[PDB]
Ligand binder design. Structure first.
Ligand SMILES: [Zn+2]
Ligand SMILES: [Zn+2]
Ligand SMILES: [Zn+2]
Ligand SMILES: [Zn+2]
Ligand SMILES: [Zn+2]
Ligand SMILES: [Zn+2]
Ligand SMILES: [Zn+2]
Ligand SMILES: [Zn+2]
Ligand SMILES: [Zn+2]
Ligand SMILES: [Zn+2]
Ligand SMILES: [Zn+2]
Ligand SMILES: [Zn+2]
Ligand SMILES: [Zn+2]
Ligand SMILES: [Zn+2]
Lengths: 190, 190
């Protein structure tokens, strides 16, 4: 070190933050079906350090430590695991789990300060008996139907716009079955 | 084409059906934590045929078709997906799901007609409100604590002994996130 059909040119550009708004498409929650591990505990045990070292050695300005701090802020979350199936997202803290059958509310295209772009896929929990986040957004470098390989998820109870504003913290999830070594390889290979 | 710590000599022999009973150890249900796809639909759509072809070309007697029929009988199941977490096994048929918090009831060492050996890990559902199988058994070429890569599961409502007798049908589950191509590779690489 690819996980289904290779990417087309539009898809590859899209993954690199280059795309036309007209090529963005709606997605179903099932693109994120599966069980997923938070990568934060891997950061916190030093097991992602090889990733930060490769990134440092390839950037002229940033040190290993600056890069590691960037991902520390980015990955931080107490949601250790996320399960998605049958329209339901389940959030695991410790031995506490919450869940909701989320309603899709479309997407939002963002342009970052760098000029690169990304798409958030928006969902809302309207179950009054749920203790899960009212608003969630998926971001995973994909702009049209395709099974996700890993994702960044924004979670909150205030508004969708509050989450659209969040640029520094993006809890990150890889397939649960991967070993720490396999997560590291994935991070170095895409 | 390995998914955590490489196997030791005892482990490798054990995976090949060679081991001393004294080296068998209890395991927790969490060794099978995750979500898992049935490989039967891959068989049924021709997507495992490359596996059967390699196996045929390496066996002096059996044809591609004889091998494929063996796995057809072996893999057959209507349980398309299995999810395991927090001591609960959840079985998915179509849009119907059942589940139970299973009680561990030890293991059973079997010796096959070939003289090779295997270990079944036994669980029982005692939840009167559950519609899940009363008895289940995991078999996955592992005889001591270790996260499973794939497993064979026996399921029934009669007795544990009935399942111990079953040698021809062994519904088989790989990590849900793998593409069909990745399942095929795994089957050709272990
Ligand atoms: Zn690799
Ligand atoms: Zn679940
Ligand atoms: Zn389903
Ligand atoms: Zn949990
Ligand atoms: Zn990413
Ligand atoms: Zn390697
Ligand atoms: Zn990859
Ligand atoms: Zn490979
Ligand atoms: Zn579940
Ligand atoms: Zn748990
Ligand atoms: Zn289901
Ligand atoms: Zn097997
Ligand atoms: Zn290949
Ligand atoms: Zn493998």
């Amino acid at each position: 070190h690819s996980h289904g059909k290779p990417l087309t040119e539009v898809e590859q550009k899209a993954a690199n933050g280059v795309f036309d708004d007209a090529n963005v498409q709606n997605r179903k929650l099932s693109d994120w079906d599966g069980v997923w591990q938070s990568v934060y505990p891997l950061l916190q045990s030093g097991k992602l350090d090889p990733v930060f070292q490769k990134k440092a050695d390839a950037d002229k300005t940033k040190t290993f430590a600056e890069i590691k701090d960037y991902y520390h802020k980015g990955y931080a979350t107490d949601i250790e695991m996320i399960g998605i199936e049958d329209g339901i997202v389940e959030f695991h803290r410790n031995n506490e789990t919450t869940s909701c059958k989320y309603d899709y509310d479309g997407y939002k295209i963002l342009t970052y300060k760098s000029g690169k772009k990304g798409v958030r896929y928006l969902f809302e929990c309207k179950d009054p008996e749920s203790k899960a986040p009212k608003y969630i957004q998926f971001s995973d470098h994909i702009i049209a139907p395709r099974k996700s390989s890993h994702f960044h998820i924004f979670m909150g109870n205030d508004s969708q716009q509050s989450l659209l504003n969040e640029m520094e913290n993006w809890p990150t999830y890889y397939p649960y079955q991967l070993s720490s070594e396999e997560v590291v390889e994935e991070m170095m290979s895409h």
